Design a protein around this ligand. Sequence first.
Ligand SMILES: CC(=O)N[C@@H]1[C@@H](O)[C@H](O)[C@@H](CO)NC[C@H]1O
Ligand SMILES: [Ca+2]
Length: 647
Amino acid sequence: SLQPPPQQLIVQNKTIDLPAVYQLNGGEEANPHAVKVLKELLSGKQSSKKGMLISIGEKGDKSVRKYSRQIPDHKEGYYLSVNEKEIVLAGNDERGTYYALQTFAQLLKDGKLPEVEIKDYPSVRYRGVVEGFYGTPWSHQARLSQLKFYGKNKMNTYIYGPKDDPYHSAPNWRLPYPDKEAAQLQELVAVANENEVDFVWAIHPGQDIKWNKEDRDLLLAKFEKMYQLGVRSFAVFFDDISGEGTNPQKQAELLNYIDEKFAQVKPDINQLVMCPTEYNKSWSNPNGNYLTTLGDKLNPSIQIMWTGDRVISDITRDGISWINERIKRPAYIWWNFPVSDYVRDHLLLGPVYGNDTTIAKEMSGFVTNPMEHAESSKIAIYSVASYAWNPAKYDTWQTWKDAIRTILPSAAEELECFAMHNSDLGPNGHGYRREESMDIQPAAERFLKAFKEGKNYDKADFETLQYTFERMKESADILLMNTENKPLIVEITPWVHQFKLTAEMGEEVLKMVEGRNESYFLRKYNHVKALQQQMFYIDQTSNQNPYQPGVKTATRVIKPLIDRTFATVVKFFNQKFNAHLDATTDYMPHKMLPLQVKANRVLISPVEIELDAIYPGENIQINFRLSAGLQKAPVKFVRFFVLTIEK
Ligand SMILES: CC(=O)N[C@@H]1[C@@H](O)[C@H](O)[C@@H](CO)NC[C@H]1O
Ligand SMILES: [Ca+2]
């Protein structure tokens, strides 16, 4: 399946071998980046004047003159032909030729090629990734991996802007990178060029910028330093700030000066981009002069970013029409998915969907803000590439499976299984959600409706949950041991263990429901208890970040089904056997409205608490904000909303 799907595709249900010998035409005058790819694919063969003709070039090259009318008249467009007599790889421009090559490579399999004719180009001008999340910035190696992934997928934009880079944001935005980080950026730029990606270096000065000449020159000197590293595209981000830096006329004048005295003055600068302080509708002020000032004063070649109706949202026709009317140009979309920097205990591995597929003309660019997990982000990023190139043919689910099979061909079913049940965000302040476990939600919701009322449940529904748990465990175990993409495995490992625990708890809970007799029920019940505790252990020892620490998985449908089924059978067992088995579903070592444990804090989900031991106390915070520092006092009980201790 060709990804992204071409704007036009004629297939002949015939195929042809790849020239064992051929004659390369236009190998000298064509884009070197595209001739390298071609020369890599024809490795093992050779050229004479004998042999099948392969013509490669840009409109205006001599090699593709026969085809000038076939070449779509679009930046990045290309004609691609394969038939018995010859192969054609002709781009409207140099990047086009290279994209023609990225398509040619997906056609080739086992030394064979279909008879095809393709006219292709992108519906959206700028397409790619903005590394612009909070949290650990992508490693150097991950970045190198991303840029080749972008090239295979016809993404032409990498916007470097990790919030937690101190040379990107305050206060060291004024300082050049040190030797090491600078030699790495240099490399990244070279890798970006070779894959036809625009490295866009962003800067995030707003929080402490002074509107004087000193800070202005400092920004340009920084831009100048990046230029010497090879950067040829630039942005300035005023997102997530307060104070003076939020002045729209000042920002506009600063962008216009960069434009006028830097971007329109170098020989070869490409994109100049800005992210507004008011970057989505909910954060706008309809009655304030901010967005209209930007649209009026910002020079017309400068891009303005937008994330939609909310901080996290999908792009609607009405939504983009709303912003466009104010900024007076087609918005450059910053799409906050699969970024999870606000639900960092979740992985977001579901399909990319929700964006209107008929509004390509109303956007200048489309970029995805990804997870801090670089390889786990490839699923969405591949889907975004597909959507942004050919929205009209955007196929959510197909593109997802395609992504997954590309990233992990050795274990693709296993990764689908995992991903299918790691897509929802859980409740969050942005109110943004995704579906999850849709395939089994039906049989789950009936099994649970039936159960809760002494109505027997459908046996096939019980079997389907069983089959699911089984498949999850096969997936988790195979994934852990997969060595084809180790970086990917390292990123997901904690979630893979928790995902396995989940499915085991599901099996044991199902066994409780069967529950042949008393002793057996009790064995299963204890096993469950222990599995819960293991889940808690993982949740307090992995991914301990300061914000949403820990590891949640299959949270939308599966865990709730397991938790509730457990509480129910436990109830029936107590009723019938007069027992007082505890029904609680999450392990909690402390006692008290469930308690939670976050890092070194113990809290009641918003009279007396008994901790599992004696600890030195740090402080208590309460809100009906009260705050008493405990000053290392040994504390085990707390009577009368969060307690912090030493841990
Ligand atoms: C334009 C934009 O989304 N900027 C930031 C971005 O860095 C975040 O990663 C995004 C997703 O949490 N939130 C909006 C805001 O905090
Ligand atoms: Ca040329």
